[PDB]
Design an enzyme around this catalytic site. Structure first.
Site, PDB file in Angstrom:
ATOM      1  N   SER A 110      43.705  41.967  40.435  1.00  0.00           N
ATOM      2  CA  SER A 110      43.928  42.543  41.751  1.00  0.00           C
ATOM      3  C   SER A 110      43.414  43.963  41.891  1.00  0.00           C
ATOM      4  O   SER A 110      43.363  44.472  43.018  1.00  0.00           O
ATOM      5  CB  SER A 110      45.403  42.491  42.100  1.00  0.00           C
ATOM      6  OG  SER A 110      45.809  41.139  42.139  1.00  0.00           O
TER       7      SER A 110
ATOM      8  N   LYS B  92      40.783  44.640  44.512  1.00  0.00           N
ATOM      9  CA  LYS B  92      41.083  44.798  45.930  1.00  0.00           C
ATOM     10  C   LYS B  92      40.708  46.188  46.430  1.00  0.00           C
ATOM     11  O   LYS B  92      40.413  46.355  47.618  1.00  0.00           O
ATOM     12  CB  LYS B  92      42.551  44.465  46.210  1.00  0.00           C
ATOM     13  CG  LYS B  92      42.867  42.985  45.987  1.00  0.00           C
ATOM     14  CD  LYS B  92      44.362  42.657  45.977  1.00  0.00           C
ATOM     15  CE  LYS B  92      44.534  41.151  45.919  1.00  0.00           C
ATOM     16  NZ  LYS B  92      45.523  40.631  44.924  1.00  0.00           N
TER      17      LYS B  92
ATOM     18  N   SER C 182      49.436  43.471  47.554  1.00  0.00           N
ATOM     19  CA  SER C 182      48.552  42.633  46.725  1.00  0.00           C
ATOM     20  C   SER C 182      48.348  41.233  47.298  1.00  0.00           C
ATOM     21  O   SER C 182      48.037  40.289  46.568  1.00  0.00           O
ATOM     22  CB  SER C 182      48.939  42.594  45.243  1.00  0.00           C
ATOM     23  OG  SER C 182      47.774  42.432  44.440  1.00  0.00           O
TER      24      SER C 182
ATOM     25  N   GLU D 104      40.058  34.714  45.558  1.00  0.00           N
ATOM     26  CA  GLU D 104      41.414  34.488  45.072  1.00  0.00           C
ATOM     27  C   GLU D 104      41.759  33.011  45.225  1.00  0.00           C
ATOM     28  O   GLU D 104      41.409  32.398  46.234  1.00  0.00           O
ATOM     29  CB  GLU D 104      42.423  35.291  45.898  1.00  0.00           C
ATOM     30  CG  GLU D 104      42.263  36.785  45.838  1.00  0.00           C
ATOM     31  CD  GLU D 104      42.792  37.386  44.559  1.00  0.00           C
ATOM     32  OE1 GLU D 104      42.717  38.628  44.426  1.00  0.00           O
ATOM     33  OE2 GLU D 104      43.273  36.644  43.677  1.00  0.00           O
TER      34      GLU D 104
ATOM     35  N   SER E  78      47.545  41.694  38.072  1.00  0.00           N
ATOM     36  CA  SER E  78      47.826  40.854  36.926  1.00  0.00           C
ATOM     37  C   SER E  78      47.078  39.549  37.080  1.00  0.00           C
ATOM     38  O   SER E  78      46.598  39.199  38.162  1.00  0.00           O
ATOM     39  CB  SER E  78      49.324  40.585  36.743  1.00  0.00           C
ATOM     40  OG  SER E  78      49.808  39.790  37.811  1.00  0.00           O
TER      41      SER E  78
END
Length: 263
Positions: free
Chosen positions: A45, A48, A105, A141, A212
């Protein structure tokens, strides 16, 4: 000093059973302290940040872009989307998607940002445009989090990510309005308290993005404004040998403490 810190990080890595990557830039004197700083790690993440920054860059030439509505459709939903799922069959602005991706997230929000940039290759092209030759985004994702050992997809190095995060937040990669917006979002992260922030004094200001993935991958990238000294940029990447290893945000906190006590 640098050597003592590297020795402490090596002992932390050995006792952790995993593979630790650290890059610290002290902007007071531009010193860099690296541990596996040129090895690739799965970003998870933390990628991002690059997507949100790339959308901010788009907004420099389409000034109202952040106010533009984006439809959230059932086909957009993935497992983890605490904000976007509340807007399915509705819309979110690109500002809302950026805040959701960075501060909660939200993985659906990240996919909308990736798509707004022309795909993972578009996020990577933005990285190249700002001088980052190391970052690569290859997947959407949630697959970008597979974190398989030996797989270069969706990886960067600690050195490259610290330099890029510095350029985005303290340097000139973004216009002034956009840089302030990115830093505001990072300072408002709600899901990073256990990672770098937990190893730092509460009186220091932090903007960060944690993340993570599989293989117990536990990451955080931060810009830190201490009291009494110039800002620091810190990336801590950590990954483990077991596919279903548990996240160790406390290991990142320990790396941050080593840095903040020792440098």
């Amino acid at each position: 000093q640098t050597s003592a810190v590297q020795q402490k990080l090596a002992a932390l890595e050995k006792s952790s059973g995993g593979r630790l990557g650290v890059a610290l830039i002290d902007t007071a004197d531009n010193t860099q302290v690296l541990y596996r700083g040129d090895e690739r790690f799965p970003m998870c993440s933390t990628s991002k940040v690059m997507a949100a920054a790339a959308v901010l860059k788009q907004s420099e030439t389409q000034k109202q872009l952040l106010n533009q509505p984006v439809e959230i459709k059932p086909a957009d939903l993935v497992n983890y989307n605490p904000i976007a799922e509340k807007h399915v069959n509705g819309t979110m602005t690109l500002a809302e998607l950026s805040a959701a991706a960075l501060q909660f997230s939200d993985n659906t929000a990240m996919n909308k940002l990736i798509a707004q940039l022309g795909g993972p290759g578009g996020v990577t092209a933005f990285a190249r445009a700002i001088g980052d030759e190391t970052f690569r985004l290859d997947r959407t994702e949630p697959t970008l989090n597979t974190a398989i050992p030996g797989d270069p997809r969706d990886t960067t190095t600690p050195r490259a990510m610290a330099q890029t995060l510095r350029q985005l937040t303290l340097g000139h990669a973004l216009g002034e309005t956009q840089r302030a917006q990115l830093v505001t979002w990072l300072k408002g992260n709600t899901t990073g308290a256990a990672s770098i922030r937990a190893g730092l004094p509460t009186s220091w200001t932090v903007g960060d993005k944690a993340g993570s993935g599989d293989y117990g991958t536990t990451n955080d990238i931060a810009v830190i404004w201490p009291q009494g000294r110039a800002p620091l940029v810190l990336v801590t990447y950590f990954t483990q040998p077991q596919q279903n290893a548990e996240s160790r945000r406390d290991v990142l906190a320990s790396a941050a403490r080593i840095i903040a006590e020792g440098l």
